[PDB]
Design a protein around this ligand. Structure first.
Ligand SMILES: Nc1ncnc2c1ncn2[C@@H]1O[C@H](COP(=O)(O)OP(=O)(O)O)[C@@H](O)[C@H]1O
Ligand SMILES: [Fe+2]
Ligand SMILES: [K+]
Length: 566
């Protein structure tokens, strides 16, 4: 079967994406934002991403067996908006506009419950036949947590937690409160590391062996003037935090900056000031989630844990789950967030149609790639001088070993928020100055942001305490003592790191470059951070890569078989 899975809608939506499954395999998968260059893919059908998927596979909508959407959108309209006005034909015209998606007839349209879509995106791609399912996000249609059992191809729901008790909303709100912003929860996690926790209940949470309770909010609290509990939870958490925390909300400042020639948005206070609140929010999230995970594992009698939902992006939390006595094996897909529900909806529908779903297999490289001709065209546009190195991987290795920063745009763009050797900025893992260089000099951002390493799978056993695959940078683990001081730019003081393990199959070129690097500095390990400028998504096209390379003090750009230097 050929099934196109979708997420993103013109009203009140985020993280639009499209995914095409062909006989259980990911033919193509991408986020709208990569194409629009507007972060988070807000308020839009995944028009461009779906266009890419079809082009990639050489299909039209007429070749599709089914279109799948990762929310029960009709039910949300019926419940929260007084009616679902669309025929399937009309919904399709909105999801796949005819001026972009010509069709003789309509494919069967499927709506998949939001948390089932999340769960499917983990279970079916994990390479494991059974496990316990833990979905934690902001909110699906109703619930904010789902506990389920995955076995024999089936996902069976055991329990849910209602939206008002959302751990995702809680976290966003704290992130917003600190001035980091609700749209950047990942920064809050980064900041938590520098703080100290006093009272992990925040005077709101009560914890138990199966999870948590939120006394701050009626669990059945509901917004009659919207279709999720975001605003209701926002007002409760903001009143509460101002009451118990020493600092009031950090305020956003909008002012004309004569250096930039623009009104820019800033914060009234340095958010580093809220590090204790971050630390505390992070401890609370961990505690709540440990209980939930323990609970679903015991109830199902599994020792494999699947996690998805936006909270699943909390790599710090994931790593501690991993080391938990109740967990043997863990799988969290790179696309744990809503970007993943397109793929999840496609899977749930393809499985329903008798398809067998292949494992992701240690790669998230499903987006667009570009031929040498296509890269060369973009280079000739700029008029910039460039070389075509006989051995690019070796030259890149030497650049990195010497302490230089190298843009690396190769192969199919990765999907998800993490750069993984297709659209990365590369630098020395061994350099005790590289972190400040990239944070301050290169990305002109916060000194306290952490960096993470890519390493050959074939050495990770010696480098890391756990001999497992870590293909996605979605899970933190500790390094072994023989490496806990060798890699200062990618390893914290507590010896923790958020690694990508690389196999030769998953990424031959990158694997080769890492190999060369190893001969130069001993360890086939580098710093691998997102290839983007503040306020843009990861670069996608060669023109994107050139544009960003041009405005950042990077040393080189390896784009396709070409090298460009500054
Ligand atoms: N690193 C992180 N740590 C904790 N929570 C996170 C992190 N990244 C995302 N989230 C949470 O995921 C939530 C949204 O998840 P998602 O499933 O993508 O959308 P929705 O909740 O609308 O279905 C946000 O409220 C956010 O707090
Ligand atoms: Fe979600
Ligand atoms: K364990």
């Amino acid at each position: 079967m050929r099934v196109l899975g979708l997420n993103g809608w013109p009203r009140d939506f985020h993280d639009a994406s499209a995914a095409l499954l062909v006989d259980g395999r990911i033919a193509a998968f991408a986020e709208e934002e990569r194409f629009t260059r507007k972060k988070h893919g807000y308020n839009t059908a995944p028009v461009q991403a779906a266009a890419f998927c079809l082009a990639q596979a050489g299909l039209t909508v007429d070749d599709l067996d089914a279109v799948a959407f990762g929310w029960d959108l009709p039910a949300m309209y019926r419940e929260r908006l007084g009616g679902w006005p669309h025929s399937d034909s009309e919904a399709l015209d909105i999801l796949l506009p005819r001026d972009v998606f010509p069709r003789r007839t309509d494919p069967p349209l499927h709506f998949v419950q939001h948390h089932l879509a999340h769960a499917a995106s983990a279970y079916y791609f994990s390479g494991e036949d059974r496990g316990a399912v833990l979905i934690v996000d902001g909110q699906g249609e109703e619930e904010c947590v789902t506990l389920a059992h995955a076995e024999g191809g089936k996902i069976t729901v055991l329990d849910t937690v209602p939206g008002a008790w959302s751990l995702g909303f809680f976290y966003e709100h704290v992130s917003e409160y600190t001035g980091l912003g609700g749209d950047n929860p990942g920064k809050l996690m980064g900041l938590a590391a520098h703080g100290t926790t006093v009272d992990e209940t925040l005077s709101a949470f009560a914890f138990d062996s199966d999870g948590y309770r939120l006394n701050l909010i009626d669990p059945q609290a509901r917004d009659p003037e919207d279709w999720d509990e975001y605003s209701v939870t926002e007002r409760a958490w903001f009143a509460h935090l101002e009451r118990i925390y020493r600092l009031p909300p950090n305020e956003f400042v909008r002012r004309y900056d004569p250096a930039k020639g623009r009104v820019v948005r800033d914060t009234r206070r340095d958010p580093y000031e809220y590090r204790d609140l971050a630390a505390t929010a992070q401890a609370a999230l961990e505690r709540a989630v440990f209980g939930l995970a323990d609970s679903v594992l015991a109830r199902t009698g599994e020792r494999t844990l699947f996690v998805a939902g936006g909270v699943g992006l909390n790599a710090t939390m994931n790593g501690k789950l991993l080391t938990r006595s109740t967990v043997d094996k863990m799988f969290v897909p790179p696309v744990a967030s809503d970007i993943g529900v397109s793929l999840g909806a496609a899977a749930a529908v393809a499985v329903e149609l008798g398809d067998r779903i292949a494992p992701m297999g240690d790669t998230a490289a499903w987006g667009p790639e570009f031929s040498p001709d296509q890269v060369r065209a973009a280079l000739d546009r700029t008029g910039l001088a460039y070389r075509e190195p006989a051995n690019l991987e070796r030259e890149v290795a030497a650049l990195i070993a010497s302490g230089k920063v190298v843009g690396w745009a190769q192969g199919r763009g990765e999907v998800g928020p993490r750069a993984l050797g297709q659209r990365s900025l590369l630098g020395s893992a061994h350099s005790p100055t590289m972190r400040d260089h990239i944070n301050l000099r290169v990305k002109d951002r916060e000194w306290w942001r952490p960096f993470a390493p890519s390493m050959l799978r074939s050495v990770s056993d010696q480098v890391l305490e756990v001999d497992a695959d870590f293909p996605y940078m979605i899970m933190t683990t500790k390094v072994r003592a023989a490496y806990a001081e060798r890699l200062p730019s990618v390893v914290h003081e507590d010896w923790s790191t958020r690694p990508q393990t690389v196999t030769e199959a998953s990424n031959p070129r990158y694997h080769r470059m890492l190999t060369e690097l190893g001969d130069l500095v001993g360890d086939p390990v580098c710093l691998n951070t997102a290839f983007n400028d503040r306020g843009e998504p990861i670069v996608s096209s060669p023109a994107d890569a050139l544009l960003t390379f041009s405005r950042l003090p990077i040393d080189a750009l390896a784009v396709g078989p070409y090298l460009v230097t500054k």
